[PDB]
Amino acid sequence: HTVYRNLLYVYPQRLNFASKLASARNITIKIQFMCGEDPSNAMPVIFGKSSGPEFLQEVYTAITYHNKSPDFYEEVKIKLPAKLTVNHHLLFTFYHISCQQKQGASGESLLGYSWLPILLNERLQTGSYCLPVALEKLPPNYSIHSAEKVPLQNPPIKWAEGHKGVFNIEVQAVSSVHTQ
């Protein structure tokens, strides 16, 4: 069946932590398209791998190329809601393997978060972004701000690498015909 849709395409390109103790292959990233700040606000809008198509609330990825073909790129494809508002945002959750866990464990745990409002300052947020990572948790009302400039919070936000941008993505909206 032939359909026409306006889709958001998100390319998680590079993750560049300064830590010589970790590598990007060991950081997992969860990607969600949110309509609000509550955990229940993940929209079922991400194209899955299956035919159908299936729509997911989240995808997990690791930004590394050592185990990929040279032609590889990660492409997250999102069915935009017909009406996009300031409440819609990409939400990224980072997971890592903490060193020297109890009993020698080697499971993954929450590292932090980043996000990108899709509409900010009356402009669609397409193009290239280098995003910082907020550690531990997100403050209320995070999603109306760019992660690069959040008002002072109480308790205060802590950022990876003193608020340096570490996560490179590209974002574009494309409306086209799909032959589902």
Neighbouring CB atoms inside 10 A of 71's CB total 5
Domain count, the chain: 1
- Closest by CA position to 172, among listed 127, 120, 111, 137: 127
The resolution in angstroms reads 1.5
- Closest by CA position to 88, among listed 42, 39, 134, 150: 42
User: Which tokens belong to 175?
Assistant: 């409306």
End-to-end CA distance of the chain: give it in Å, rounded: 5
Residue range of the domain that includes 58: 3-178
Q: Is beta strand 28-34 parallel, antiparallel or unpaired with respect to 59-61?
A: antiparallel
- Closest by CA position to 56, among listed 79, 89, 83: 79
Please indicate the experimental technique that yielded this structure. Answer: X-ray
DSSP labels, 37-92: SSGGGB-S-EE-SSSS--EES-EEE----TTS-TT----EEEE--SS--TT-EEEE
Q: What CATH number should be reported for the domain holding residue 55?
A: 2.60.40.150
CA distances (Å), origin 65, targets 15, 25, 26 = 11, 8, 12
CA distances (Å), origin 9, targets 56, 77, 126 = 15, 5, 9
CA distance 157 to 132: 12
Residues 6+ apart with CB under 8 A from 154: none
Environment class of 142 (CB within 10 Å of its CB; exposed 0-12, middle 13-18, buried 19+): buried
